[PDB]
């Protein structure tokens, strides 16, 4: 289950992080 | 079954860098 | 197979916004 959680949020910061 | 999962996230990040 | 079908459209949409 961590592998999976730590996927997730690795692939969606670089949406966030190009809004600020 | 969570690789699936995180898989479907994932793949999705394009859709929102393409909106904003 | 989803996740390929979604990123296709992720860059098909944009192209539609430069006709119209």
Same mark, same amino acid.
């Given at each position: *289950?961590? *592998?999976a =959680? *730590? $996927?997730a949020? =690795?692939?969606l910061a670089p949406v966030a =992080?190009? $809004?600020f």
């Open positions: *289950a961590p *592998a =959680a *730590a $996927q949020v =690795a692939g =992080a190009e $809004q």
